[PDB]
Write an enzyme that holds these catalytic residues in place. Structure first.
Site: not given
Ligand SMILES: O=C(Nc1cccc2ccccc12)C(=O)N[C@@H]1O[C@H](CO)[C@@H](O)[C@H](O)[C@H]1O
Length: 813
Positions: A354, A545-546, A551, A653, A657
């Site tokens: 991801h 978004k976060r 971003k 994502t 939306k």
């Molecule tokens: O990698 C992601 N989060 C995290 C990164 C590093 C540590 C983490 C620890 C806990 C939860 C999420 C983490 C993440 O949110 N990735 C997102 O995945 C989405 C679904 O595939 C994509 O649409 C986003 O582009 C991507 O940033």
């Protein structure tokens, strides 16, 4: 009222009304005299839940009889949001319940607002899991979501003096009517201990035991009577745990140590923290899930059929311990030989990546795994040795490849690379958008791709059209259904048919009417729940978004200040009015992200109170962005901001939306933006900025932000305003870290995209001046958003990874 919400037949309304009163009386122990709105919500929740039960029981018994291949989606996050309206939509009960509650003298919408979000996720990764569960149920897959039942989900964000404050999300406070505890299915999970080698095999001994208690939540498919299960584990101390009065008391109080495993979701988005409690959470969910998987498989001895009956999808590396844990069970407990067990493991597991950001990769210190999971470390070393022998045989003499591909990273502290582990132990590795998947093959996993090219795939992300259209935007779903019928809701490709309505004057008027209604409704929500006053005739420019540097909320900020500066320079000149909404949570320990929030509120403080500006420019920070707030703001948006530095956003994502809900997109060629633009046509998209190749060239040469500062007078002024304390008159140096970062240590090249961004933003404003042509471009977007249904995504996973055929056929009700 509206057709897509189902029938409100006489028999059904009467039945719901009496089941509502039954629950109010028997379940809630209340009568109409003492009942609060919360009691009313709960009576409705229980009444609707009763309609799931039959289907839930018969779906699960159906899977027992037909014995299909089961899909296990393992994730640390399931960002579910509210469950009430979604259940009604999927059961075609929404109009009936609206009618039934109306007749009882209640407003159902008001009751819906009482439900807490199940905020068991951070952002995109957790929400993908949620959309996926919905699609899997809708496509008739025998799928199970496995995760952790956090007592506390993502924190509630409060803004105090422009600063983010976190408060605990005590979402279970009033109880959760959707879940069913299954204490009879409680499973033991082991930690610590040591490894003992005997005449016949290794043994993991002297361990501390934590109990895993499952809670099942129903996942209804869209009108197909399929109800799948999300099973979430809760941590419980055994009753002999830690077992003088002071000593006896303390022993009982110390049970909290064990139960802290499932207490709180780690709120860190896109950054890796090697905390022991987090590792415990990862193993906890993995160990409990794999025992449950195996038990179910045995109750159908021969593990050759295991991969024919079991698929395990790893949502990132977080449940990566599934690989050595499966090896452990198969070798240590079931006494299979290594090679056979490994064949089974690889054929069973698949891994979804991801992100490409290096700080995000899970790299667990060896000394941690040594202490907590000594047997798993031994298995990892063994996996690594056998894997590196294959690399050595394939690329003889290539010593640097060996160290690059190793699961063990040498250094000051030895670490395990969990991504390397996942690739080695999985038969499929996928990225989440075409550009992201290509980046995986060409950069970070290039060595692995060269060794095993067949393992690497793309599965472009998607969103559920149920929650993300029908539920949140009934007005838009209805006018579409008027023209093309209702079949698109579970077949989103059918939206293409709307292309023949792009010159249809009634449809243009309807599309625009629905947007304005959504904007008026949201503008009212702002006033009522937050006492903030906006112009509903302005363009709704939203970035939700976060909060992360990649971003580039900061690039948005720079544009906002440019507009303000331009207005002040020529006050009596016409500008298209904008309401600029930025929302998102910052990870609690991420200083820069917290500084960006403060910056956004600080800009609003200046802009919103300048008499010269008037209602022409408003800057609002959307507090506590979460799934339920997304369902409100996204339908109201005109402009979707997807402005990440090219190569950084794996997919996104949120972008999808907005596209589905009638906003136009300003964005870079990053993640899924590329495929969205390709589907809609580039002329129907506001594309700007460096492409990936452009970012590469700038890196080779060195990014010098000073160059842009010196050559762009408008940018120079903004930086000087920031430094001089124009946006913080009482703390003039408040934004010194932001300026310093932008000028000297910007990994994400905010300045490099500034000019193209501002120019492109002018093109947005120009289009918005022409309502008819704006709306026609909108229709072209909505009509081509079909690819981005998670039904498509899931059918691809099913066919190309899991080896199962989706089915749109109903089960009997
Ligand atoms: O990698 C992601 N989060 C995290 C990164 C590093 C540590 C983490 C620890 C806990 C939860 C999420 C983490 C993440 O949110 N990735 C997102 O995945 C989405 C679904 O595939 C994509 O649409 C986003 O582009 C991507 O940033």
């Amino acid at each position: 009222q509206i057709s897509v919400r189902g029938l409100a037949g006489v028999e059904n309304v009467t039945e719901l009304k009496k089941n509502f009163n039954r629950h109010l009386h028997f379940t809630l122990v209340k009568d109409r005299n003492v009942a609060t709105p919360r009691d009313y919500y709960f009576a409705l929740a229980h009444t609707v839940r009763d309609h799931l039960v039959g289907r839930w029981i018969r779906t699960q018994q159906h899977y027992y009889e037909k014995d299909p291949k089961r899909i296990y989606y393992l994730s640390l996050e399931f960002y579910m949001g509210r469950t009430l309206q979604n259940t009604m939509v999927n059961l075609a009960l929404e109009n009936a319940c609206d009618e039934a509650t109306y007749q009882l003298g209640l407003d159902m919408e008001e009751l819906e607002e009482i439900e807490e979000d199940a905020g068991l996720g951070n952002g995109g990764l957790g929400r993908l899991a949620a959309c996926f569960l919905d699609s899997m149920a809708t496509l008739g897959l025998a799928a199970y979501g496995y995760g952790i039942r956090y007592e506390f989900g993502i924190f509630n964000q409060k803004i105090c003096g422009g600063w983010q404050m976190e408060e605990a999300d005590d979402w279970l406070r009033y109880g959760n009517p959707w879940e069913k505890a299954r204490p009879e299915f409680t499973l033991p999970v082991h930690f610590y201990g040591r490894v003992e080698h005997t005449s016949q095999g290794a043994k993991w001994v002297d361990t501390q035991v934590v109990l895993a208690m499952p809670y099942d939540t129903p996942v209804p498919g869209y009108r197909n009577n399929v109800v799948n299960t999300m099973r979430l584990w809760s941590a419980k101390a055994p009753n002999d745990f830690n077992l003088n009065v002071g000593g006896y008391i303390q022993a009982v109080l110390d049970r909290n140590l064990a139960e802290n495993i499932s207490r709180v979701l780690y709120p860190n988005d896109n950054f890796f923290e090697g905390k022991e409690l987090r590792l415990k959470q990862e193993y906890f969910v993995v160990a409990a899930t794999l025992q449950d998987i195996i038990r179910r498989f045995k109750s159908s001895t021969n593990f050759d059929a295991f991969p024919d009956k079991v698929a395990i999808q790893l949502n990132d590396t977080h449940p990566s311990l599934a690989i050595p844990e499966l090896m452990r069970v198969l070798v240590d407990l079931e006494r299979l030989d290594w090679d056979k067990a490994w064949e089974v493991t690889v054929k069973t597991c698949a891994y979804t990546n991801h992100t490409v950001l290096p700080e995000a990769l899970e790299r667990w210190p060896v000394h941690l795994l040594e202490t907590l999971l000594p047997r798993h470390l031994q298995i990892i070393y063994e996996i690594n040795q056998r894997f590196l022998n294959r690399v050595a045989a394939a690329f003889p003499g290539d010593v640097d490849r060996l160290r690059r591909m190793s699961l063990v990273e040498e250094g000051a502290v030895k670490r395990i690379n969990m991504a390397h582990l996942c690739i080695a132990g999985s038969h499929a590795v996928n990225g989440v958008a075409r550009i992201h998947s290509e980046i995986l093959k060409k950069t970070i996993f290039k060595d692995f791709y060269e060794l095993e090219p067949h393992k690497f795939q793309n599965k472009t992300n998607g969103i559920t059209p149920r929650r993300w259209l029908v539920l949140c935007n009934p007005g838009l779903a209805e006018i579409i259904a008027e023209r093309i019928g209702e079949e698109y809701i579970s077949d989103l490709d059918q939206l293409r048919k709307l292309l023949s309505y792009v010159d249809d004057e009634a449809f243009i008027r309807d599309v625009a009417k629905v947007k304005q209604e959504n904007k008026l409704k949201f503008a009212a929500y702002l006033e009522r729940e937050y006492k903030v006053h906006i112009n509903p005739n302005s363009l709704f420019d939203v970035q939700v978004k976060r909060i992360h540097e990649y971003k580039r909320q900061l690039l948005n900020c720079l544009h906002v200040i440019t507009l303000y500066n331009r207005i002040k320079k020529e006050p009596n000149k016409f500008v298209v009015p904008r309401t600029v909404m930025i929302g998102g949570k910052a990870a609690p320990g991420y200083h820069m992200a917290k500084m960006i929030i403060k910056l956004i509120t600080a800009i609003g403080d200046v802009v919103n109170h300048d008499p010269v500006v008037g209602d022409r420019l408003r800057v609002i920070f959307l507090e506590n962005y979460r799934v339920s707030l997304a369902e409100k703001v996204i339908p109201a948006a005109d402009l979707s901001e997807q402005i990440s530095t090219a190569g950084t956003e794996a997919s996104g994502t949120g972008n999808m939306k907005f596209m589905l809900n009638g906003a136009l997109t300003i964005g870079t060629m990053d993640g899924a933006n590329v495929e969205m633009a390709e589907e809609a046509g580039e002329e129907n998209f506001f594309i700007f900025g460096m492409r990936v190749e452009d970012v590469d060239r700038l890196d080779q040469r060195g990014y010098n932000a000073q160059e842009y500062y010196d050559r762009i007078p408008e940018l120079r002024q903004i930086i000087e305003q920031l430094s001089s304390g124009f946006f913080s008159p009482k703390q003039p140096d408040l934004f010194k870290d932001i300026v310093n970062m932008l000028m000297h240590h910007d990994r994400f090249k905010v300045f490099a995209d500034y000019e193209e961004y501002v120019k492109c933003q002018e093109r947005v404003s120009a289009l918005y001046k022409n309502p008819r042509e704006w709306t026609r471009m909108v229709i072209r977007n909505i009509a081509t958003s079909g690819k981005f249904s998670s039904d498509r995504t899931i059918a691809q996973y099913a066919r190309e990874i899991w080896g199962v055929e989706p089915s749109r056929q109903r089960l009997p009700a």
